[PDB]
Amino acid sequence: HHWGYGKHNGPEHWHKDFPIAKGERQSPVDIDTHTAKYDPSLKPLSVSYDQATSLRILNNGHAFNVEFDDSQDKAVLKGGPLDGTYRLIQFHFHWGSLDGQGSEHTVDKKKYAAELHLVHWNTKYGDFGKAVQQPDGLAVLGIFLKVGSAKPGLQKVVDVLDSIKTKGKSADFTNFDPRGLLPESLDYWTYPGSLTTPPLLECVTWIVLKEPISVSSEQVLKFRKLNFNGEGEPEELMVDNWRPAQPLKNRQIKASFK
Ligand SMILES: NS(=O)(=O)c1ccc(N2CCCC2=O)c([N+](=O)[O-])c1
Ligand SMILES: [Hg+2]
Ligand SMILES: [Zn+2]
């Protein structure tokens, strides 16, 4: 049938409906810290979320997205390897069924517990659907999550997961401040990639932050109680909604540090 992360519709079957899966700039990738080139021409990352306006949280059957009001230059990301401004449209996670897997990007073949992706689109393109049609249309900020101490700013996300347990369910989720999810350092690795879930459009400029954020075992656990299925259908827990690392091919991962 249609895509997912199960044995019969998982990552290894996506190339049949979306031939771009075997593309030239696919994400995620394994970041080799010793092969990544330090580039001093890379400017600092500029995250301006002080005027962020969260609107809703939704379970789309592949994960839960927290959507923001992107009708104005409220929550933007600029600087880094980017040219111009990018509006935060939404953020989501990708976790595992166990604490030793869940991240999509790996650092030195190392996988973390999960991975937050704050999706952004280039404003010089008007809307989101026009950005996915250009090679520099999106900038996803990747933040790894490791199990350890709780993350206060992530708790308001965790408590509303009961009301979006199944596919297609939503809930009013305003006043969330994404700044409470950012690690202390903004060091990062950037590289040209794509979406990690279908359509798998090669339109992303990936900015994977070097520093991870810790979340309690209790916080990641409550992610695993969500379901892929819609209401009234046989329960399938939402776990391992991550794509395996892809070939780097004709690409170079740059770093803003040494
Ligand atoms: N996992 S990622 O961040 O690569 C990612 C995965 C999927 C999507 N899309 C595309 C259509 C709806 C949606 O959620 C995006 N995206 O916003 O482009 C991002
Ligand atoms: Hg594109
Ligand atoms: Zn993602």
Q: Where are the domains of the chain?
A: 1-258
> Resolution, rounded to a tenth of an Å?
2.6
3-state secondary structure 177-243: CHHHHCCCCCCEEEEEECCCCCCCCCCEEEEEECCCEEECHHHHHCCCCCECCCCCCCCCECCCCCC
Q: Just give the CATH number of 1-258.
A: 3.10.200.10
CB-based pocket (< 6 A), ligand 1: 117, 119, 132, 138, 140, 195-197
Ligand 2 midpoint to CA 136 (Å): 7
Which residue lies with its CA nearest to atom 3 of ligand 1? 117
List, as one string, the DSSP characters of the chain: ----SSTTTSGGGTTTT-GGGG-SS-S--EE-TTTSEE-TTPPPEEEE-TT--EEEEEE-SS-EEEEE--SSSSSEEEETT--S-EEEEEEE----SSTT---SSEETTB--SEEEEEEEEEGGGSSHHHHTTSTT-EEEEEEEEEESS--GGGHHHHTTGGGG-STT-EEE--S--GGGG--S---EEEEEE--SSTT--S-EEEEEESS-EEE-HHHHHTTTT-BSS-TTS---B-----PPPPP--S---EES--
Active site residue 1: no
Method of determination is X-ray
Q: Which of 56, 67, 91, 119 to mutate to test the pocket of ligand 1 (most atoms within 8 A of CB)?
A: 119
- Ligand in closest contact with the CA of 92: 3
- 1, 62, 105, 120: the active-site residue: 62
Which residue lies with its CA nearest to atom 18 of ligand 1? 195
